[PDB]
Design a protein around this ligand. Sequence first.
Ligand SMILES: [N-]=[N+]=NC[C@H]1O[C@@H](n2cnc3c(N)ncnc32)[C@H](O)[C@@H]1O
Ligand SMILES: [N-]=[N+]=NC[C@H]1O[C@@H](n2cnc3c(N)ncnc32)[C@H](O)[C@@H]1O
Ligand SMILES: [N-]=[N+]=NC[C@H]1O[C@@H](n2cnc3c(N)ncnc32)[C@H](O)[C@@H]1O
Ligand SMILES: [N-]=[N+]=NC[C@H]1O[C@@H](n2cnc3c(N)ncnc32)[C@H](O)[C@@H]1O
Ligand SMILES: [N-]=[N+]=NC[C@H]1O[C@@H](n2cnc3c(N)ncnc32)[C@H](O)[C@@H]1O
Ligand SMILES: [N-]=[N+]=NC[C@H]1O[C@@H](n2cnc3c(N)ncnc32)[C@H](O)[C@@H]1O
Ligand SMILES: [N-]=[N+]=NC[C@H]1O[C@@H](n2cnc3c(N)ncnc32)[C@H](O)[C@@H]1O
Ligand SMILES: [N-]=[N+]=NC[C@H]1O[C@@H](n2cnc3c(N)ncnc32)[C@H](O)[C@@H]1O
Lengths: 260, 260, 260, 260
Amino acid sequence: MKYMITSKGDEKSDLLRLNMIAGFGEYDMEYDDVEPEIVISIGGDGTFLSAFHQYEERLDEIAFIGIHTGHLGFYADWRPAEADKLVKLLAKGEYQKVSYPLLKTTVKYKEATYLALNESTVKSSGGPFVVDVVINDIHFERFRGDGLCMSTPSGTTAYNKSLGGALMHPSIEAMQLTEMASINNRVYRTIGSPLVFPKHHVVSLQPVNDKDFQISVDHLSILHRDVQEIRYEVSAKKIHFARFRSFPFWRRVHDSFIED
Amino acid sequence: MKYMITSKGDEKSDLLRLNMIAGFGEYDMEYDDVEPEIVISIGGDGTFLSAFHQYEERLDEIAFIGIHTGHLGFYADWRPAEADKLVKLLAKGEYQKVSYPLLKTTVKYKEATYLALNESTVKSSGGPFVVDVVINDIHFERFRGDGLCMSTPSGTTAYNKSLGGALMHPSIEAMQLTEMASINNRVYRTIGSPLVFPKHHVVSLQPVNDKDFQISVDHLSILHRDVQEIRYEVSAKKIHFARFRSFPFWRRVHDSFIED
Amino acid sequence: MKYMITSKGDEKSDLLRLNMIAGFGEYDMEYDDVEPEIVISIGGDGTFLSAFHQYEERLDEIAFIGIHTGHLGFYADWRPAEADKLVKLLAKGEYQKVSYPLLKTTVKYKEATYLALNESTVKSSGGPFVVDVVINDIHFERFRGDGLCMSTPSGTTAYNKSLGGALMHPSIEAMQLTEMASINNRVYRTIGSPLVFPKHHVVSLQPVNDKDFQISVDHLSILHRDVQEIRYEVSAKKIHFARFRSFPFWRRVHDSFIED
Amino acid sequence: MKYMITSKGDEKSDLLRLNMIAGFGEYDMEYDDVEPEIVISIGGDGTFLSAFHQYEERLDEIAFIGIHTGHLGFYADWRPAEADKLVKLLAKGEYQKVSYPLLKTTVKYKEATYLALNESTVKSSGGPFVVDVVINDIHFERFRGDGLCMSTPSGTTAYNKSLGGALMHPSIEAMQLTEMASINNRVYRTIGSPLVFPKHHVVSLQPVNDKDFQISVDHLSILHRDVQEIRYEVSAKKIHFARFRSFPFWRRVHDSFIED
Ligand SMILES: [N-]=[N+]=NC[C@H]1O[C@@H](n2cnc3c(N)ncnc32)[C@H](O)[C@@H]1O
Ligand SMILES: [N-]=[N+]=NC[C@H]1O[C@@H](n2cnc3c(N)ncnc32)[C@H](O)[C@@H]1O
Ligand SMILES: [N-]=[N+]=NC[C@H]1O[C@@H](n2cnc3c(N)ncnc32)[C@H](O)[C@@H]1O
Ligand SMILES: [N-]=[N+]=NC[C@H]1O[C@@H](n2cnc3c(N)ncnc32)[C@H](O)[C@@H]1O
Ligand SMILES: [N-]=[N+]=NC[C@H]1O[C@@H](n2cnc3c(N)ncnc32)[C@H](O)[C@@H]1O
Ligand SMILES: [N-]=[N+]=NC[C@H]1O[C@@H](n2cnc3c(N)ncnc32)[C@H](O)[C@@H]1O
Ligand SMILES: [N-]=[N+]=NC[C@H]1O[C@@H](n2cnc3c(N)ncnc32)[C@H](O)[C@@H]1O
Ligand SMILES: [N-]=[N+]=NC[C@H]1O[C@@H](n2cnc3c(N)ncnc32)[C@H](O)[C@@H]1O
């Protein structure tokens, strides 16, 4: 199986990458960073996020595996000390594929579409942020505040969590919208609560005054001008993970937030 | 079709019930509060909750309809002034069935099982509340605080919402666990965030010291003694609603929380 | 100086108490649990709370000191291993007095008044909790939910904190009101935010329907019937601590919540 | 008494300003926008904020009055229809002065100091925001998240409120620090809770990596580079309001958030 290895780029990760490549050379495994079938990310979640976006055009033909040489490393399944065992199991091909839902963001001015593994957020390009929130064509609320965050299930443990959102098991095909510092008084009103949307539900954001927004997709933050609308929906595309052992989402959550 | 009508029991609701019964008499519709196929609740959500629990043994053979003579009336689809039109449409049989997921609660000492339309909560029988939270057999956290709330999708707009939980579209077969005043310090740690569980996931609560708990299921609150565990899962059973017109969940939410 | 020592009552604490008493016997220090000038609490915050309430009638003539043989021990200034040094310093009389504000609760039916070091809360005697919140005679809100919590500054790190309240430095003579699971929809509205009141401000709770409430003052929970109103204000009374060394409130907070 | 009038600048406000000036001309009142003793702001809170900052160098010699021609208008005491009565009372000099505490922000690179009526916030100049929070020289926490907000008492109803902060009566000389989307996991830890600091307490923010920050003071947002630290304390300066009638803070809060 063709494979490639991304590295955090520090001494630890680069060296681990070289040793794994050496180990793969001992098997019938070809290194290909153009059309790999397996992508190994060595680092933290930032590194993993980069790996995903590097191959967001071949998500259907790739299974990802993360090795934790970072700090938290939520998307990682392996410790550096287990790298050799990983090489072996990957060789023998003893693994099952697991899929997590992704978030599709469409920005219309022309249209640009982005794919997110964690979340997509919107803020003002400086100045007051005000947007009408439209759900399946029904006007739901006019949001005034710092911004909004739309999260995938696996992303609910990231930015979403910090914003008071619920943690959502990845087997649920959904997206979750959370508020950033909503204004609520006699005249201005938002739902307040995070909202969880099923697949096939469309959430659209529509400018009220200012049409310039800072839009983020995972680690990438882009300024969009003359925006007509931002549209969120659960992507038809899924990220696939290669699992060689049981590591339940809730245990992953426990280890990352309660105690490791 | 056999039908029955529950009433809030005030002047307004009783009279509306009598007029509807009269209207039904003009059709080939038999009133039967033993084995009805349609249950009409006239009142608020409290009244609707009572109706559901009165027939929780025949949920598969019943479609519910709510008329709003209460204050908020979230589960209601009709205003009193539309009662006549409702009678007519019910007669002609022009309606489609819609299903919402329910929550199963099992209390083991012997075992008692309850079914919830909104939520099930647990608190201490007076004194400190401490329980181990076990998800699919994995020990997730030890919860210290006032109590916990497990909500259905349609219940997420109720108690769940007040506790900071996410609002969850009823098409998502899930349950959501929220905290009540969790203690979090150097020594005590909880996830904090609401947790959303898919169908077939089991959340079990296990006593640490005190074994006596006050357990609520919707409007019903019962004291259980010598409790060994409380087990939550998404019920295989669903409540069925009779819909004669489009009234999307998110519009229902908008009307109840943003503006009517 | 007359002194008394309260003990958690476990093996560790009782023995520590005996050794300290022995050490005090070597000085001109008389043990008196009737009219002591110094009260030493050996245990956790629960033990300290008990000590305070045991002498809430002589708060003006007493300085408290806590020794930590409990788990968290927020009000404690000493570790068991330092007991000998404490005995010595207490003997030589090398210490300065520090005062924290207290909360006065008045319950009218006849009137009963309670004094709180941490907080006073109100909940329903079973059933729905609804009260009108009146601030300095002006009707502020009608609260529907689980209950309310009124906290002292030093109490803001306790129950108050779990309810989303702000942490408040004890030098600020104030009380803070937090909500428990307030209902907020189209028809029901509360402020949501914690409220911080200065000295001489009076917050009164007035029943809307049910007149029976469960009222807590620190560790004590009492059911009151035929309640006409509950009145909160910053007490004119203060608790005095004996400080032999610098241990700033914010460091106390850091040690208890961030890292020890 | 010398006076000046700021205007929102719309048709309504400008015309109201002209009529008031005409009314003042009928008395011995001189219009002076250089060294006025009374500053009347006609508009919303944004307009009022601008008025305050226009004369932040003469806060000791000025009493402010707001007229509400805006939307919410929290700092306003008057409706446009009462302008004539205001002119009269201002003439006869029938009013009492009321003072609210202010927030001092010091930015060191050289030093710049700003004065805030509502709040001062800090965010990253793009990229991750990380700062060490130092309280009175003691290292309290390392904050990772979107940013921080330090609010005056009267400012607690603004940005502070949206961030989950407590509402604080203006008679309390304090400042309140709230978090924006703090990261909290196994490795990263913040207090979470808003913090309320008394006068003479100093809160300092110190860069960990990036030294560039976006710093806001009320409506003004400035990018600072090569920042060594940001220092917050309760200002020795106070804003003075001219009150011609009783309008308690808590009633002001009720009217702005509960019902007008
Ligand atoms: N800001 N930020 N990101 C830093 C934290 O987010 C973590 N992170 C990124 N993605 C996730 C994620 N999906 N779940 C939990 N934590 C995550 C990353 O590892 C850092 O600990
Ligand atoms: N790992 N990493 N970096 C990208 C992630 O940063 C996360 N992030 C950014 N800001 C915050 C934040 N304030 N809290 C938690 N996570 C955050 C977000 O989830 C992005 O996917
Ligand atoms: N406490 N309580 N219940 C009172 C409010 O809860 C409302 N309620 C009950 N069930 C729901 C519900 N599912 N969604 C929203 N509100 C609900 C009920 O109508 C009252 O307005
Ligand atoms: N309608 N009704 N009564 C039953 C509902 O009361 C709701 N409830 C009880 N306490 C609260 C509460 N504090 N906030 C919101 N809802 C609440 C809960 O959802 C029950 O299903
Ligand atoms: N529930 N409860 N109480 C248990 C926790 O509250 C702690 N506690 C009591 N009073 C305070 C307090 N004032 N500040 C912080 N923690 C406190 C006590 O030590 C336990 O850790
Ligand atoms: N130590 N102790 N026991 C009494 C304290 O318990 C605290 N307490 C009770 N319930 C909670 C709670 N849910 N969270 C935090 N603290 C709590 C409250 O502050 C009382 O003063
Ligand atoms: N974002 N923003 N500001 C808009 C809202 O904040 C309001 N505002 C400004 N200052 C305060 C304030 N101090 N209290 C309450 N609301 C305030 C202003 O009137 C707008 O309604
Ligand atoms: N009026 N006005 N504009 C300035 C105020 O905007 C307020 N503000 C900015 N963002 C928010 C926000 N997200 N929520 C509430 N208030 C906000 C803040 O209090 C400033 O003083």
